[PDB]
């Protein structure tokens, strides 16, 4: 079709690759360890460090991305991020042969390469997307992440079953490379730099962004962002991501050790939760708009209601899943419900940053993500240390503490959230 939508059909696949290279290990690990590929004798704590080392890098390059993107554009940044991630993915096997240290190091470098994507995309859309249309283009671009954390698990299971685990990494790295070639050939960082764009589209985009860009006032300065209504968003994000990452990283292990599912079935059934989450975050915005039309609700009742739901429903159903372990089906159903209701959050704390201080979101997202990334560095560690022997009495404990985290986060948000403006964003 046009140029901007082609960019949004190349960013979709880029984020697909991002999240696939992020998630594939959660599956490949349950076959890389011992009780036709090579198998290593990782202990418990070691698997946790391996699964967490990605976020020790993801956290480093989240905010610096916003600066490096305004410096050298978004195209090369995202391209090199994906390329480094994929090339290191190719070497992950040769690294495992060298030990665990190199493996965690390689995953952390993957994290450095991956964390610089979203800021680059924001930068590119700040020059490509007209305001009346970026709500759709950003959605297209970011749905690739959900599709990736949906599809990289079934494919990883298929491959690890019919073939060795090495081929997961080989295939996904080759894909990342064959995508970087396109990202380099076609895309540009700004319309006037595009080589095959038409004059009318260029003028439409520039005329849409003219007054908006010339109305920027809050760029060259930044006030004190230590207002409690921001720590509420940060805490809710930390809480949600604790559960989300703990599962993303240790759910296949649960399905293979406790439920005793095959690897194929493991990868196929570990996608249902995130597919449900996708559908739920697709329907939640519609429902919230229809609700604000039904009644005013001050635009804050919506945030806190949807947050309460998407952070307590998960807790309840996850506790229930832990309570009835060793059942093939009901536990899968309850984990699915748990990570499905978690999609209501896309109309709560994951959006309050646009109502609290717009025109400053570029850095509020960075703060929130940099704070809510810590659980990726912790959860997979203690959730596996508490379970040296994968007995249901151990997993119940991590489920309980994760549910308590979700609950405390929801309480904090409901108490201290604001939804109109915070008096320092006023340009």
CA atoms within 13 A on the CB side of 186: 16
Q: Do 241 and 175 share a domain, yes or no?
A: no
Q: Do 88 and 187 share a domain, yes or no?
A: yes
Alpha helices by DSSP H, listed for 324-360, are: 330-341, 352-356
Q: Across-strand partners of 365?
A: none
Q: Return d(Cα 339, Cα 76) in angstroms, integer.
A: 34
Phi-psi region of 298 (alpha: psi -120 to 50; beta: other; left: phi over 0): left
Q: Across-strand partners of 40?
A: 33
Q: What angle do CA 59, 336, 232 make, to 5 degrees?
A: 40
CA atoms within 13 A on the CB side of 281: 23
Give the residue from 193, 215, 237 where a domain finishes.
215
Q: Residue 405 sits in which domain range? A: 226-427
Q: Do 242 and 197 share a domain, yes or no?
A: no
Q: How many helices (H) and strands (E) does the chain have?
A: 19, 0
Q: Which residues contact 130 (CB under 8 A, 6 or more apart)?
A: 204, 205, 208, 209
Q: Which residues contact 183 (CB under 8 A, 6 or more apart)?
A: 10, 14, 75, 78, 79, 82
Is 220 within the bounds of a domain?
no
Structure tokens at 75: 């195209």
Q: Do 389 and 420 share a domain, yes or no?
A: yes
Structure tokens at 332: 């899968």
Is 315 within the bounds of a domain?
yes
Q: Do 60 and 122 share a domain, yes or no?
A: yes
Structure tokens at 180: 């970087």
**Contacts made by residues 178-183, CB under 8 angstroms, sequence distance 24+:** 179/10, 179/13, 179/14, 179/17, 179/82, 180/79, 180/82, 180/83, 180/86, 182/10, 183/10, 183/14, 183/75, 183/78, 183/79, 183/82
- Torsion angle in degrees (nearest 10) through CA of 37, 255, 42, 45: 160
Alpha helices by DSSP H, listed for 258-329, are: 263-269, 272-294, 301-323
Q: Return d(Cα 58, Cα 369) in angstroms, integer.
A: 9
Q: At what angle do helices 3-32 and 75-96 cross, to 10 degrees?
A: 20
**What's this structure's resolution in Å?**
3.2
Is residue 197 helix, strand or coil?
Answer: coil
Structure tokens at 285: 């915005």
User: 241 and 375 in contact (C-beta within 8 Å)?
Assistant: yes
Q: Do 62 and 182 share a domain, yes or no?
A: yes
Q: Which residues contact 339 (CB under 8 A, 6 or more apart)?
A: 244, 247, 273, 274, 276, 277, 314
CA atoms within 13 A on the CB side of 359: 19
Q: Do 137 and 248 share a domain, yes or no?
A: no
Q: Do 187 and 233 share a domain, yes or no?
A: no
Is 221 within the bounds of a domain?
no
Is 52 within the bounds of a domain?
yes
Q: Give the residue among 142, 128, 114, 119 at the shortest CA–CA distance from 189.
A: 128
The total number of structural domains in the chain stands at 2
Question: What technique solved it?
Answer: cryo-EM
Q: Return d(Cα 40, Cα 360) in angstroms, integer.
A: 47
Torsion 179-180-181-183 (CA) sign: positive
Is 79 within the bounds of a domain?
yes
Q: At what angle do helices 3-32 and 117-128 cross, to 10 degrees?
A: 170
Q: Do 205 and 231 share a domain, yes or no?
A: no
**CATH assignment at residue 149:** 1.20.1250.20
Is 291 within the bounds of a domain?
yes
Is 185 within the bounds of a domain?
yes
Structure tokens at 352: 């309050």
Q: Return d(Cα 119, Cα 141) in angstroms, integer.
A: 13
Q: Do 245 and 201 share a domain, yes or no?
A: no
Q: Give the residue among 222, 248, 219, 238 at the shortest CA–CA distance from 368.
A: 238
Structure tokens at 144: 């690739």
């Amino acid at each position: 079709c046009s140029a901007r939508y082609n960019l949004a059909i190349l960013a979709f696949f880029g984020f697909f690759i991002v999240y696939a290279l992020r998630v594939n290990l959660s599956v490949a690990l349950v076959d890389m360890v011992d009780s036709t590929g090579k198998k290593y004798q990782w202990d418990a704590e070691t698997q946790g460090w391996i699964l967490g080392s990605f976020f020790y890098g993801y956290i480093i390059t989240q905010i610096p991305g916003g600066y490096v993107a305004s410096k050298i554009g978004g195209k090369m940044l995202l391209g090199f991020g994906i390329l480094g991630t994929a090339v290191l993915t190719l070497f992950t096997p040769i690294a495992a042969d060298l030990g665990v240290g190199p493996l965690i190091v390689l995953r952390a470098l993957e994290g450095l390469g991956e964390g610089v994507t979203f800021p680059a995309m924001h930068a590119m859309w700040s020059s490509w997307a007209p305001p009346l249309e970026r709500s759709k283009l950003l959605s297209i671009s970011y749905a690739g992440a959900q599709l990736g954390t949906v599809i990289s698990l079934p494919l990883s299971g298929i491959i690890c079953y019919y073939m060795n685990w090495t081929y997961v990494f080989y295939f996904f790295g080759t894909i990342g490379i064959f995508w970087f070639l396109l990202w380099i050939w076609l895309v540009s960082d700004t319309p006037q730099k595009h080589k095959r764009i038409s004059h009318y589209e260029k003028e439409y985009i520039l005329s849409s962004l003219r007054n908006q860009l010339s109305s920027q006032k809050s760029v060259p300065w930044v006030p004190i962002l230590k207002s409690l209504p921001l720590w509420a968003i940060v805490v809710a994000h930390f809480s949600y991501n604790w559960t989300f990452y703990t599962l993303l990283t240790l759910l296949p292990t649960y399905m293979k050790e406790i439920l005793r599912f095959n690897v194929q079935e493991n990868g196929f059934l570990s996608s249902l939760p995130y597919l449900g989450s996708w559908l739920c975050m697709i329907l939640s915005g519609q429902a919230a708009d229809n609700l604000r039309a039904k009644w005013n609700f001050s635009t804050l009742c919506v945030r806190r209601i949807f947050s309460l739901i998407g952070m307590i429903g998960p807790a309840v159903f996850l506790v229930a899943a832990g309570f009835i372990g060793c059942d093939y089906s009901l536990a899968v159903a309850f984990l699915t419900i748990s990570t499905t209701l978690g999609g209501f959050c896309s109309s709560g704390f994951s959006i309050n940053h646009l109502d609290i201080a717009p025109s400053y979101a570029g850095i509020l997202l960075g703060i929130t993500n940099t704070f809510a990334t810590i659980p990726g560095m912790v959860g997979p560690v203690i959730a596996k240390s508490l379970t040296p022997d994968n007995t249901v009495g151990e997993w119940q404990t991590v489920f309980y503490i994760a549910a308590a985290i979700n609950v405390f986060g929801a309480i904090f948000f409901t108490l201290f959230a604001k939804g109109e403006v915070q008096n320092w964003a006023l340009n």
